[model samples]
Target: PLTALSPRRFVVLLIFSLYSLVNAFQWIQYSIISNVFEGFYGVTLLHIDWLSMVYMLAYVPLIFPATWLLDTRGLRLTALLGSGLNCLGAWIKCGSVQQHLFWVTMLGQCLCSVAQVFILGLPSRIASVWFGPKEVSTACATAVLGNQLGTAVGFLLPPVLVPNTQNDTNLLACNISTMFYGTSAVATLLFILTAIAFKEKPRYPPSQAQAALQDSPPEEYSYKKSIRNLFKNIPFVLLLITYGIMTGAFYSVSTLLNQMILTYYEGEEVNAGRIGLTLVVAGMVGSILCGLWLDYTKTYKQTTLIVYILSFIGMVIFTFTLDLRYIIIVFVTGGVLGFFMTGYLPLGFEFAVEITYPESEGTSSGLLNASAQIFGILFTLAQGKLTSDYGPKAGNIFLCVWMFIGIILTALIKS
Candidate 1:
């Protein structure tokens, strides 16, 4: 009933994944230069943080509508909408840079946030549609890898272009402008590729399940019934909460990494980018390794539990080591922490689909994303206020409490 992955199908998946990179690259440009942007934009840390936060903020509310588009319109059209918005957002931000207006940039970021919702919702669907069940987790991880790689570059590239030093505000503005231009250029090219290359589905279904779908009536599955069943399932709900807590905290760390790094190592902006890059890179490696291992072992629960314990330990080490002023310890602990946190993300997605078998992958994965965004907004806002009133130390403590909660919830999730 199914055939092997065709080269044309693979090309389409690759293009879809590349849009993930553009989606993230558009927004993360702010974090790469925290202090520098605060001065250049004449805004506070919260103001600058909002640029990144809006990505999650907008996604929280809009994911349902975005996923609906995916469920109804099919992949090719949905991807064009996402990549088209991404490209438009990038150019909008470039125009904002030319004018040097913060609000304009905020609007642009909001557009990119919309693009994020579409692209993020598709990874599970992509893997299921394009790859066989045996390769699904790895395919999902590789698709995610494109976004992780984008974020890694987002973390590294700006600092390389603009030094962490804020002695020259004008220079920082110029560097920031350069960043916006570069992003717009890359997005433009990706958009063109998506329009030309992406396909709706493979000519032959790739999995036995998909083949079954083709054999059945088109209207057999009800989206409403599927979601109702998903919420009613205790394991799915548990996975939702545990995944939310873990990913929500990870989102918080990602958003505030620059601010935290700049505080711990004052005036060393380059170090901030490098540290951020290290965390994302570590996460990327963790994601692939975990994906492959989970596929081979089919031990979702054990793998998740191990990652939870390892992540908690890493976060504790990172928290305590930040005070010691030893970059080496910070890097090691933070990298380990990021590795487990990021690794667990794809695990959560796949596990949710497994536990909620018969439900749409887009629905389960979208709900997970929505939960993460909900908590992400809450954590970022709470931590932002905490950091402002107290110090970065206070914020770190806030993250630690949540990590402990995540561990407990993960233990509760049997599947």
Candidate 2:
């Protein structure tokens, strides 16, 4: 079978990456400035938390349908849905900047949350379909990095753009409107680009694996069977659990990062945002480096195991040192913790693809993300309760215990 990679793949990747970034940027946009949103909208903190939590909630139920669409309908249709909803959601949010329209903003957030389902499981599918074997891991990492970059920007941008304007309602409203308008414009532009440029697939397959998939009769493919096969594979199951623990802990920590920091460092909201930025920025670097290592050595299991163990150690160190009253130390530890934890994300995706070969990449990655969302919701609630009851130390200890379990699971994987 003759197959060849194309430069057009880069165009698809770049546009997809930018759209993913924008969608993910919306996920944390309100939460990072929770206090500001609460004051501006006259809503409770829990309501603000729900804005971010809705993404996980929506993904849990919607991922299966979204994956089915990706598998059956192919990339162009999925991209259209994802980008279109994202654009519409952003515009709705722009209209919801009024003080009385918190629910309207939520409606927008829910739309963006649903859009996330179509975007999250796609890195592996895009990498496989558009890239050669030698570059697939790197491509997947790059794609994931776009989302991470958005998150990093989300953490940093909100605090700077809209400060605590409890005394200045008009100013607060104006700043928020500006942010919303900017996001709406970008989302619309990306949606237009995706509609014009994103293709279903290349003229030729980019790798032998993709070529083989193309050769298979469409009727022979079964989404239900693909899911059943994944569950029956012990290694894939192990990966699913371990990925959930690590990624879920990251989610929990990220969601509550400001609360955790403010517990010790009072009135340091900006610093909390900086710490979050440090975390994700370091993880982006770790992500690309890990991807390059995977492509160079193809050591998915060893690399994943080592990263898992390091994440545990990083969590432990951060947990203990956070109360030391040195903000610099917390920043360093946060960055180290993120380097291992968030970097573990794409490793799970690529490794899942490896173990579940011939199964749909969409199916494998969707299950992995679904597991993460389940754990993310659980861990956030549990850790939040623990933190309120005991302190951030107890909350973090809860996550550390899970990470240790993840280490064991990673070791047990037969891949």
Candidate 3:
């Protein structure tokens, strides 16, 4: 039932994973250093929030076209284009240091967001096309791990590289520029590596399941038809709605987390970053564990629903615990919440593929994330309103309600 693994397979994944990493790196670069942007760029929290939310905002309009590109052109070409844009985006920001050209940095980040369209949608395709069924879950997990690792690095590095400075906008801008250049260099290297090492698909079938995919006709689910087909699939649509809401909540949390921390902790920006890192790192662990568990069990619907419930529980705890100002409790509870909520990410991706079997993984994944971006933007903007009117607790409670709805909807799925 299992196919032989190859060194070449491992190499292909490693290359794309690097692209996954840097795209994530670019998106969150402004999020961790929100304070720095406030002080150095004289930007409002809303402005700093735009720097991060734009990553998702751009995705809303562009992802449909990105889906068409990936579905029509396939992985190799899309990835090359993605890597190239990713590098260019990073380098473009290096030019933003000449003054407080916030728009320029935002523009560069928008390009990186475009690159995210290609890289983020490829994970499920990579698992299905490159790895054997026996390894598919783990492969998907590893692919997502790359992105989570980037978020962790993004959280950790910003505080260290650009400390919170007051009134010294020039020094802050210079350090920000250095961080951009360093990130650019890494992006350039990943582009080169991906260009040289990546292959579109394997020469031989890696597994019987993939062999079936290879044997299918070219027009089986063409770009246009795939979109129509995905809409017809009931389970997939429900999952899409739920996944979008959940991801939207997480993105909102990530963008405004510093505010949440400061409200309760009183100027602990460094601790805010640390809390973020802990959340992502713990989620990284949960992703891998859930991946392995799903592979062994093949319980896609069950696993998804259970994780949904777990995340809900975590959110409930945070709704009350967050304003308490206990550092130790915050980290521990935060990690627990992150472990479940963030961990749900990959499962949502993989389940999208499972529910819409025989559809191009790229199409399903693209729509899945497209919905997420739309919701993420709405939720991010909504939180601003909710927090302004009622406080952070209202926003947190709002997320918990939607997550509860997600659990109920997920329970109704047959697969």
Candidate 3 lDDT over 212-287, as tens digits, reads 7678766644667788988988888899998998899888888878777776777677788898889989988887
Runs of candidate 3 with Cα error greater than 4 angstroms are 1-6, 127-133, 201-205, 208-217, 296-302, 358-360
Number of the top candidate by lDDT? 2
Ranking by TM-score: 1, 2, 3
- Error at 185, model 2, angstroms: 0.8
- Summarize candidate 2's per-residue lDDT along 1-415 as a digit string, tens digits: 8899889999999999999999888988787777788778887767766787889999998988887678788989999999999999999999987889998899999999999999887877889999999898678778877889989988888878887767988898999999999999999999999999999999999999999989987764566788898999999999999998888899888888877886888767788889999999999888778877887997889999999989899999999999999999999999999998888887887898888887876678778888999898888888878876898999899999999999998999986
lDDT of 1 at 36: 70
Error of 2 at 210 (Å): 4.6
Candidate 1: tens digits of C-alpha lDDT, residues 7-116: 67677778877779877766666766766778777778888778878888888878777766776778888788888898888888877753258888888888898888
Q: Could you give the candidate ranking by lDDT, starting with the highest?
A: 2, 3, 1
> Model 3 reaches what TM-score against the true structure?
0.90
Model 1, TM vs. native = 0.93
- TM, every model: 0.93, 0.92, 0.90
- Model 3 CA lDDT for position 355: 76
Per-residue lDDT of 203 in model 1 = 84
Model 3 lDDT on a 0 to 1 scale: 0.82
